[PDB]
Amino acid sequence: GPLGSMDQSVAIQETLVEGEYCVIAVQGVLCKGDSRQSRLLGLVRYRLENDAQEHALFLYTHRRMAITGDDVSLDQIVPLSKDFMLEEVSPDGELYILGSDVTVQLNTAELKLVFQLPFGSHTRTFLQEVARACPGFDPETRDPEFEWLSRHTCAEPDAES
Numbered sequence: 001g002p003l004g005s006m007d008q009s010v011a012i013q014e015t016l017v018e019g020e021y022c023v024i025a026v027q028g029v030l031c032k033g034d035s036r037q038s039r040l041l042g043l044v045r046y047r048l049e050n051d052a053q054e055h056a057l058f059l060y061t062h063r064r065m066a067i068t069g070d071d072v073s074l075d076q077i078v079p080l081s082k083d084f085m086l087e088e089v090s091p092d093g094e095l096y097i098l099g100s101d102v103t104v105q106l107n108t109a110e111l112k113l114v115f116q117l118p119f120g121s122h123t124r125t126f127l128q129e130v131a132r133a134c135p136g137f138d139p140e141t142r143d144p145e146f147e148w149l150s151r152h153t154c155a156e157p158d159a160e161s
Helices: 008-015 123-132
Strands: 022-024 027-032 035-048 051-061 074-078 102-107 112-117
Antiparallel strands (some): 027 112
16 A cells, blocks of 8 residues: 555556666547547666666557556657657646646647646656756757667557557
8 A cells, every 4th residue: 555656657667667666657548529538658877887867758558447557558759859848738728738637738749649647646756857858958959869779579469449
């Protein structure tokens, strides 16, 4: 009974693979038309025996309640790059878009979706990890890295969903 956090992080760790290192992984939502969908987020930090490390934003699919980690594995890949940027949705709420929820819109070079994560709690940890994941709030940030992702082959795309 860890209390304060579910097992998202663990779920990925099991699905991930040895030698690697899981840092954080929450659970967001994706709303389209009138069909609600559930997506499992994950962040993995990979280091080299020579120091030189790299980060990438892993995407894990999952059923409605397949969060457990039992039936969820790599579904896509999103490597942090300069073209990466997060945009808040027009508040027009009262003073805050979050509070009781988290409204964030990822505007990458091509990736453009809407994720609704739960207010802080386990979501806050994710935000901070992303910042250090490479951006390290630098005014001259511009050095994408993904040459090591090729290592990953992701689950078999035989889903035919």
